[PDB]
Amino acid sequence: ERGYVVRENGPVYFTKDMDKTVKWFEEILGWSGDIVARDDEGFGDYGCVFDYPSEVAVAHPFRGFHLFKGEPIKGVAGFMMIEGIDALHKYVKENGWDQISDIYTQPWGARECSITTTDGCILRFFESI
Amino acid sequence: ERGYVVRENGPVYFTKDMDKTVKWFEEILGWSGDIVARDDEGFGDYGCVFDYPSEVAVAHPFRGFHLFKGEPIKGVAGFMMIEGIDALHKYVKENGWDQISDIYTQPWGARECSITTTDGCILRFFESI
Numbered sequence: 001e002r003g004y005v006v007r008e009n010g011p012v013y014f015t016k017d018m019d020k021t022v023k024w025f026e027e028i029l030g031w032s033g034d035i036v037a038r039d040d041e042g043f044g045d046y047g048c049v050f051d052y053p054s055e056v057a058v059a060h061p062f063r064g065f066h067l068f069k070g071e072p073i074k075g076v077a078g079f080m081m082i083e084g085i086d087a088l089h090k091y092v093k094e095n096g097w098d099q100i101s102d103i104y105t106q107p108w109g110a111r112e113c114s115i116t117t118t119d120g121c122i123l124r125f126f127e128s129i
Numbered sequence: 130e131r132g133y134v135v136r137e138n139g140p141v142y143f144t145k146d147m148d149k150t151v152k153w154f155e156e157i158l159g160w161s162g163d164i165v166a167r168d169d170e171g172f173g174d175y176g177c178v179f180d181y182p183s184e185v186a187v188a189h190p191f192r193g194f195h196l197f198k199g200e201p202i203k204g205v206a207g208f209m210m211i212e213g214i215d216a217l218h219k220y221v222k223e224n225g226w227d228q229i230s231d232i233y234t235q236p237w238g239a240r241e242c243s244i245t246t247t248d249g250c251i252l253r254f255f256e257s258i
Contacts (some may be wrong), residue, residue, distance in 0.1 A: 001158060001159030001160065001180060001216075001220060002159055002216065002220050003213045003215075003217070003219070003220060004211055004213030004214070004216045004217040004220070005180065005211065005212050005213065006192065006209055006210075007209075007210045007211060008160065008192070008209060008210040009139070009140060009180075009192045009207065009209040009210075010138070010140070010141070010195070010206065010208070010209075010235040011138060011140035011141065012205055012206065012208050030130035030131055031130070036160055036176025037237070046237075050235065051130060051134065051135040057251070061135070061179075063135060063138040064138070066208050068205070069151060070204070075199075076141055076197070076231045077141070078138065078141065078253060079138075079139070079141050079195050080135055080136075080137065080138045081135075081136045081137040081138075081191075082133055082134060082135050082136055083134050084133030084134065084135055085133065086132075087130075087131065087132025087133040088132070088133040089131070089132070090132065091130060091132060108166075113218055127248055128142075
């Protein structure tokens with residue numbers, strides 16, 4: 001570009017119950033969430049979830065999801081590269097969530113598996129072979 | 130989590146004609162792009178765009194958009210923090226794109242403006258005060 005730079009560009013996520021979403025992220029994937037703004041009636045308007053600990057987030061980068069109020073995405077909402085996919089699948093499974101696909105190898109050189117959230121969107125995870 | 134870390138998490142973006150989308154990101158926002166795989170008819174199935182030069186990406190630290198073939202997103206597709214919001218607006222306008230809202234101040238402490246892409250999605254840009 002010219003005259004400007006991108007500092008952060010984290011993915012967006014939409015929900016009709018921000019607290020439920022945050023809890024799913026924390027209980028099923030082991031992430032940390034935080035509602036940043038609430039409605040006059042106490043409903044979440046804006047927030048976020050990240051895979052690292054709350055601490056690190058309070059002192060800066062951002063690789064989590066921004067949470068906005070609205071109709072949840074229908075289809076793929078995330079495409080994440082990770083380390084420890086096997087561990088991921090076990091963790092999610094141990095936590096009781098069964099809506100996760102088996103792990104499989106992609107033609108482009110990586111093992112993948114995808115998860116459906118409480119809101120119904122698909123999150124795709126992958127690790128290079 | 131436990132046993133796994135998120136290495137990268139760039140936002141997803143869907144398009145029916147990747148080349149046109151990539152040209153837009155290049156001509157209007159001054160970004161860079163590359164189509165990694167095409168279909169039997171010549172269209173891109175997978176690719177990406179990023180704010181920095183090609184030199185970085187091939188030399189990993191991925192914060193652009195992953196591009197997949199599909200129906201464009203209706204509504205907000207990006208929420209990114211930037212520096213030089215005035216420069217951005219002028220750059221876009223200077224490059225002939227008129228579907229960019231004016232810059233305005235948000236209650237939460239930042240100036241913002243949204244841009245409509247060639248595909249119809251909305252990209253929100255903000256800079257804190």
